[PDB]
């Protein structure tokens with residue numbers, strides 16, 4: 022994995038030694054090259070993972086996430102180009118450095134082979150995100166958003182550290198291969214219940230879970246465009262990856278402790294979709310849609326069947342791409358009119374046709390239009406939940422109906438209707454924005470063409 | 481305190497004579513490289529604080545930073561390796577000396593071992 | 602008033618100073634080359650080359666190998682009258698039940 | 701574990717082969733499938749029952765040890781049933 | 788404090804509810820006296836009568852909380868015939884929290900105290916059952 | 928002006944040389960895990976007449 026790790030640590034000095042007007046070009050070009058290099062990790066085996074060394078290993082679950090991160094970095098660079106025109110050279114270089122450090126930490130987190138190193142890096146990702154939000158946010162609430170985000174994550178994750186060190190002392194090693202081969206059943210006692218609670222609650226707060234999710238709207242609304250792109254697409258998937266990794270040692274207690282979280286996740290899907298129905302802010306709508314999709318992924322992981330993990334992985338990848346595209350579109354509309362109110366600007370299909378097309382495609386992918394990988398993952402999760410019980414079908418059906426409702430509602434509100442008369446600063450869409458949307462959308466269709474690459478290790 | 485009070489321990493000795501039987505760290509050690517990196521970062525921070533060109537001023541003092549960090553890191557690594565070797569030696573000696581406290585257990589194959597099966601449904 | 606504060610500046614339009622702007626930079630040459638490198642590298646290299654690389658990735662998942670092995674086992678089983686699928690994964694002779 | 705995983709994949713492909721046989725036979729027979737392609741139905745029933753008994757609900761973290769534990773439990777249940785029948 | 792805790796633990800769980808309540812009341816009274824002493828030391832009263840009034844208020848509140856907790860937990864355990872159950876301690880803790888809320892005349896304080904005290908009493912019962920130790924003796 | 932081109936575009940070799948160095952380090956780490964080379968039950972094999980290691 023050093024062939025991918027080192028080029029990022031070379032992106033840092035290149036960014037700091039490049040000329041003032043070449044930083045964006047160099048960063049984008051070399052990020053694209055690193056993504057191309059990281060595409061080689063998709064050649065996974067069928068039985069065991071790729072064990073590069075004692076420290077780093079790659080699996081069919083880690084590879085798509087690494088590819089997604091390496092692909093997402095240059096798009097964040099383009100968005101930063103968009104919204105950081107008047108910043109000074111040193112501050113622009115600091116912003117690029119924060120993005121590069123976040124990508125490096127995410128890569129090492131996904132490829133870590135031990136739970137303690139995974140925890141260290143997964144907590145190390147907090148610092149760049151907090152700095153980005155609280156430093157380059159546009160409104161007053163960015164400080165409160167950063168505080169909520171940081172303290173929710175830490176309050177979740179500290180008992181995870183205690184549980185991890187306890188597990189190492191009890192068993193001998195935190196290496197994932199060892200804890201998988203040497204796994205033993207977990208008895209139904211209070212101590213085991215609390216260890217299960219520690220680990221699961223940490224990853225659920227990171228996920229997030231319904232009732233532990235206010236930090237997500239707070240941080241995503243107030244973060245800059247790059248921060249919102251990385252928060253929704255990759256940083257939300259750390260909880261899912263951890264749960265898919267940490268549940269190896271929590272059986273059979275997971276069969277008994279999953280009920281409260283399953284009920285919370287399903288009713289949270291319903292509640293967050295209903296909230297999306299009546300949101301006056303576009304970014305809040307996108308954030309709550311992200312919450313609903315992550316709740317569905319939680320349901321899949323908790324029911325924990327071979328058909329549910331494949332759906333979970335596919336839905337994670339698809340939701341990451343779709344949410345990034347939606348946030349980019351919302352940011353373009355915001356930068357045109359300098360306001361996040363959804364009903365402020367209308368007639369955007371009359372004023373900007375190509376952006377209307379991008380909005381249509383993004384909203385169709387959001388509501389899981391077949392044969393998109395969004396629908397593939399959702400359908401696998403629904404089938405597994407149906408096998409689990411026969412009322413989950415009712416809950417999933419109503420959630421799907423409300424999801425389509427609010428997706429088409431935001432599409433019709435923003436794009437269709439009569440344009441606002443007094444808004445006369447709607448300039449034609451930039452080639453940069455069009456290319457950003459195209460680079461967001463084309464990989465989704467290509468993964469639809471080849472879906473076996475994002476179905477996890479249980480394929 | 482665990483190691484302090486060990487028999488034969490000479491006080492205020494960074495590296496005793498028995499530590500010379502261990503392989504010295506290689507000069508290309510990743511830990512030594514990280515120590516040199518810390519020295520280089522300290523030099524850059526010195527330039528930044530004193531308001532000098534960060535990457536081009538004070539090359540001699542940056543080199544001195546790197547050299548001092550590498551030197552101290554090398555000696556620290558030697559001491560750390562000696563301490564870990566001593567710990568392993570003492571552990572093995574005690575395990576040898578107390579076989580009734582550290583007994584061998586019978587190895588049963590999984591065909592003989594009975595373990596409960598918990599279905600996932 | 603409470604501070605000696607600058608007034609909020611009006612937002613600059615890239616199309617005013619450069620009608621052929623691609624939206625990347627206010628410098629025309631830098632903007633043009635940023636657009637060119639982004640388009641070339643991203644679209645051409647990443648999309649086309651990575652897509653064909655993933656399409657022609659070798660079959661390390663052993664799907665075709667598994668299919669051939671299944672065909673061989675099915676042929677051998679039904680040729681000799683043996684059941685196609687065994688009752689147990691392991692050997693009861695090697696398994697010793699506690700009693 | 702590696703050997704068991706390879707065997708599991710081979711068994712999955714065997715089940716796929718039998719299902720392909722059944723589908724092709726149904727389509728070929730057409731209007732008289734309920735009687736003509738009853739030989740494929742019995743083979744598919746046997747293969748499906750054996751596959752379910754072997755790789756039943758082992759979960760997403762299935763392993764050779766878990767399959768062995770399931771087989772031991774099934775063998776104990778069969779032995780107890782046989783004893784209580786012929787005892 | 789160790790003697791009082793030993794008396795409380797030596798009284799059987801599901802039986803001798805009056806003695807269990809007396810032990811809990813003694814523990815609560817000792818805690819209230821300590822809190823009153825610290826409060827008087829740090830924030831001096833205006834007069835001796837006011838200091839005595841503050842000490843009496845704190846001691847009565849703590850003793851009432853302890854008595855209510857002990858009575859509720861023992862009665863619940865006896866009527867349910869299910870000792871070694873954290874639910875009895877949870878009920879007693881919420882009852883003590885409601886008693887504190889009644890003493891302070893605050894519904895929100897009462898509700899929060901019920902929740903937190905029930906949770907911590909359930910934790911204490913689980914620790915008693917499972918052998919958890921707060922101040923572990925140096926072992927390794 | 929060739930010096931100016933180098934003085935401005937010398938940062939474009941950092942990522943390629945980092946990739947090369949990463950590949951070299953990956954190979955050097957792989958050479959430290961040769962304890963079971965040509966010793967596994969599944970892939971144990973007699974060496975070819977002109978061969979010393981099954982894999983590097």
Ligand SMILES: CCCCCCCCCCCCCCCCCC(=O)OC[C@H](COP(=O)(O)OCCN)OC(=O)CCCCCCCCCCCCCCCCC
Nearest residue numbers: 230231232233285288289292892893894895896897898899
């Ligand atoms: C993850 C999804 C979300 C899951 C969680 C959703 C939220 C659940 C909890 C909702 C809130 C419940 C109430 C909690 C606080 C109660 C205390 C309170 O509100 O105190 C403040 C107020 C003080 O009132 P005061 O100032 O005196 O005067 C004004 C009017 N008299 O006090 C009052 O005015 C007192 C009014 C009391 C009215 C009755 C309250 C009943 C409900 C609370 C108890 C519920 C118990 C459930 C038990 C379940 C067991 C399985």
